[PDB]
Ligand binder design. Structure first.
Ligand SMILES: CCCCCCCCCCCO[C@@H]1O[C@H](CO)[C@@H](O[C@H]2O[C@H](CO)[C@@H](O)[C@H](O)[C@H]2O)[C@H](O)[C@H]1O
Lengths: 95, 92, 54, 427, 160
């Protein structure tokens, strides 16, 4: 229980990260922290409901990895020759 | 399985090791750039995952029988289709 | 007098048209193209939907 | 099994494409998609439940439509990079999985399965395409985070990660909201819709076709599985409808206007969720995937990178049947009788009113009437005097595609008593 | 319990605060590895042991290593310089973060749960039969996800 609240606080912290971070990689990082908050909550509740939540959290980790591969791949691809990685440098597409 | 004491012991061990590290330090007081090194880093972060799944099988394996083995086989073959791809694609 | 009045009535309906036009290009102006803005509006939105239910 | 066909073809084609020419791989992915689809048609009314995997009416219809989107999108993309077909197969299977389970975590896996290769498909390598891919990816991953935390809170408020679990008080609600965030984002419902215009305008056009049809389809299939509460449902609807049409007014570019149109349409579709009828939603999405698919095929035959609305004008003179089919599409997307789109809209509205959501319903209807501004501004624009406009008058493939799929529309406008009898359990 | 727990959770929140605060990408990521270490600790303390070790090995060990290779292979900590600040956003980001915190705290309040399960220290001996068992479909699906993921990532780079 004491942990669950820390999980929520962490997720919030990650949200703050995403909203605050100026560069792509670091926004992505803040997202990773959020994911981890979720994982911790999954562990606590697994400890309440019996272990399926651990397998869950592990699958979650795997998934996270996959999207890290693709996401960093994208970040590198788009910004390789291009200059500074600040994500607001791409504002061409306007509503 | 293991008594919880030995994780604490692990941590203590870490403490000693770190302190000694600090000690030795104080005796010190006495284009294409990403591609390769990215691809072969990403594949690390994938094989770590693979193995992270293979370990739970390797322990409870004979208990899981031919269907368990079949599962681990399928899994392995999928991921190796991936690796075989980025191998046949080439990495340099 | 009443003819030109009626012309003014139709004109006013068109005014409603332009009201929807205005509001519309106001809602479409919400998409700057800046990703940080999108994230802000997003988290905000989530907070909104969450705020409605429980 | 459809899943079997998809898995087999994907894994096989991955390494086979090293030994096959890109074109041959296109033939491959086409055949595979077609076979999955055929397997679906042959088991209509089978309900096949395996593990977390479950093929019922919903999975059947929505993966039928999704596979149709995959089929059409693959048709148009001769450009040789065998992955630019492979990834479509990957995405396709993923969308199937997404439509085929109530298991939250497998659902997440399916979401990544379909949305990861799409981040890649947003690359015609155009500077704007890269922007689209980047936005889609970041906002996507954040949405993912929310959906995952929602799953963890669902597993919080109940011992399961399966939807259909009885459900508590507050924590359960918070869980459903946190799920609706990610799922809603994936279906372009407000206020989770921001990515849609930039991504549709930025991505290569056939890819956008694939998205606006298949993705939305699977997304809603997965939304049927959620116990979506009346309040949240109302919010999502009202916002999506209003923002959709009203912002759609200000659009001077075709694809982006169609994105906003898709936001409003998601708004209308969500009404079916009020009862979660799924027979209504199925029909609606049949008409929608047909007409939208058509519209985007036509918009493909003009320009892949981007299309201004002026380009649409004079289309009739150039190709009479593409002009007519495009008009018909615009009218069916308007929801004007006697076209199938009208029946879809009616069938969703019907569930809204049946549920007793009257204010929401009316609002939707008012702004739907508003939407007649821009749907006509295209369909009619078909007959205008041609500006100097790019036009590659298509193969028999695409012409017969747009024409047939178009004919289907008013075919079901006159006779919805053809397909509607069984978009249900299959009887 | 609370003796270690206080220090552990404080260190957790502190670490997260750092990873979202630091203006050095290398330093940030690094702080996140500290986080993952402590997190694996907490997992161990939460009878999820194998998961903890995978937490060090995969998450701390591998993933943030890829992050580091990438921020080092472009440029780290010098990317944030630009000064298109939007500091009217910082209190709004902070406020919205506090909101997304408050809502979760609210939903978590009044929860009386038996955190007493026999979940015999997350060992893979007990984890296995579930994984290659009731979880085998999700496992395999995940595998496919990894394959598709690598094909994407490679095709997402592919110079020439
Ligand atoms: C390469 C492409 C990859 C795509 C994914 C393909 C995966 C197919 C592999 C299926 C094996 O996965 C596994 O199947 C069996 C039966 O279906 C499941 O077993 C479960 O379902 C059955 C039937 O309702 C129940 O009797 C049983 O109590 C339950 O444990 C198990 O939970 C699942 O985890």
């Amino acid at each position: 229980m004491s942990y669950l609240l820390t999980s929520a606080l962490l997720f919030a912290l990650g949200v703050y990260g995403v909203l605050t971070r100026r560069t792509a990689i670091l926004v992505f990082l803040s997202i990773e922290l959020m994911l981890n908050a979720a994982n911790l909550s999954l562990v606590g509740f697994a400890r309440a409901y019996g272990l399926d939540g651990q397998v869950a959290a592990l699958m979650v980790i795997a998934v996270a990895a996959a999207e890290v591969a693709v996401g960093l791949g994208l970040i590198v691809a788009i910004f390789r020759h291009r200059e500074s990685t600040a994500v607001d440098d791409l504002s061409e597409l306007r509503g | 399985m293991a008594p919880i004491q030995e994780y604490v012991g692990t941590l203590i061990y870490v403490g000693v090791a770190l302190f000694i590290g600090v000690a030795a330090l104080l005796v010190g007081a006495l284009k294409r750039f990403p591609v390769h090194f990215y691809v072969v880093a990403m594949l690390f972060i994938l094989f770590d995952v693979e193995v992270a799944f293979l370990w739970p099988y390797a322990v409870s394996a004979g208990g899981l029988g031919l269907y368990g083995f079949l599962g681990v086989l399928a899994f392995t073959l999928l991921l190796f289709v991936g690796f075989l791809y980025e191998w046949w694609k080439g990495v340099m | 007098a009443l003819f030109y009045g009626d012309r003014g009535l139709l004109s006013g309906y068109f005014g409603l048209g332009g009201a929807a036009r205005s509001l519309g290009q106001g809602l479409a102006r919400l998409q700057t193209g800046y990703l940080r803005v999108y994230a802000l509006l997003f988290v905000l939105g989530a907070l909104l939907l969450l705020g409605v239910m429980r | 099994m459809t899943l079997a066909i998809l898995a087999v073809f994907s894994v096989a084609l991955t390494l086979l494409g090293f030994v096959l020419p890109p074109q041959g791989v296109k033939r491959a992915t086409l055949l595979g998609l077609a076979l999955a689809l055929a397997s679906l048609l042959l088991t209509w009314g089978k309900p096949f439940a395996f593990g977390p995997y479950a093929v019922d009416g919903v999975s059947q219809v929505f993966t039928l439509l999704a596979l149709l989107g995959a089929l059409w999108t693959v048709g148009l993309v001769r450009s040789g990079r065998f992955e630019f077909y492979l990834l479509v197969l990957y995405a396709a299977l993923g969308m199937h999985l997404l439509a085929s389970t109530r298991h939250l975590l497998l659902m997440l896996v399916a979401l990544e399965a379909l949305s990861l290769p799409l981040y890649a498909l947003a690359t015609w390598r155009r500077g704007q395409g890269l922007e689209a891919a980047l936005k889609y990816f970041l906002l996507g991953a954040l949405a993912a985070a929310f959906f995952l935390y929602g799953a963890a809170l669902f597993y919080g408020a109940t011992g399961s990660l399966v939807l259909g679990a009885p459900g508590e008080g507050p924590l359960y609600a918070l869980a459903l909201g946190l799920l609706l965030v990610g799922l809603g984002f994936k279906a372009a419902l407000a206020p989770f819709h921001f990515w849609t215009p930039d991504v549709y305008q930025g991505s290569p056009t056939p890819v956008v076709l694939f998205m606006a049809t298949s993705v939305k389809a699977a997304a809603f299939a997965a939304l049927l599985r959620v116990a979506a509460p009346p309040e949240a449902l109302a919010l999502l609807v009202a916002l999506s409808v209003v923002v959709g049409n009203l912002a759609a007014l200000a659009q001077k570019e075709a694809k982006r206007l169609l994105a906003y149109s898709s936001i409003a349409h998601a708004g209308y579709m969500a009404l079916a969720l009020y009862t979660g009828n799924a027979q209504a939603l199925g029909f609606y999405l049949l008409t929608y995937v047909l007409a939208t698919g058509l519209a985007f095929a036509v918009l493909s035959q003009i320009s892949p990178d981007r299309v201004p609305l002026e380009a649409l004008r004079g289309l009739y003179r150039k190709d009479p049947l593409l002009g007519l089919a495009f008009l018909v599409a615009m009218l069916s997307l308007l929801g004007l009788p006697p076209l199938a789109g009208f029946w879809g809209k009616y069938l969703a509205f019907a569930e809204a009113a049946r549920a007793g959501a009257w204010g929401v319903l009316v609002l939707a209807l008012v702004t739907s009437a508003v939407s007649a501004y821009y749907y006509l501004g295209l369909g009619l624009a078909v007959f205008a005097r041609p500006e100097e406009t790019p036009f590659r008058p298509g193969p028999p493939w695409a012409r017969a595609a747009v024409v047939a799929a178009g004919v289907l529309l008013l075919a079901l406008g006159l006779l919805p008593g053809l397909v509607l009898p069984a978009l249900a359990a299959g009887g | 319990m609370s003796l270690l727990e206080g220090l552990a959770l404080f260190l957790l929140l502190l670490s997260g605060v750092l990873v979202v605060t630091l203006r050095n990408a290398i330093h940030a990521a690094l702080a996140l590895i500290l986080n993952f270490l402590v997190l694996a600790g907490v997992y161990v303390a939460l009878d999820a042991r194998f998961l903890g070790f995978i937490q060090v090995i995969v998450y701390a060990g591998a993933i943030v290593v890829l992050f580091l290779f990438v921020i080092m292979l472009l440029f780290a900590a010098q990317g944030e310089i630009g000064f298109d600040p939007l500091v009217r956003s910082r209190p709004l980001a902070a406020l919205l973060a506090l909101g997304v915190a408050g809502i979760l705290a609210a939903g978590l309040w009044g929860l009386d749960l038996a955190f007493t399960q026999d979940l015999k220290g997350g060992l893979p001996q007990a984890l296995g039969p579930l994984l290659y068992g009731d979880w085998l479909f999700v496992l395999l699906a995940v595998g496919f996800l990894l394959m598709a993921a690598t094909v994407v990532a490679v095709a997402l780079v592919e110079p020439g």
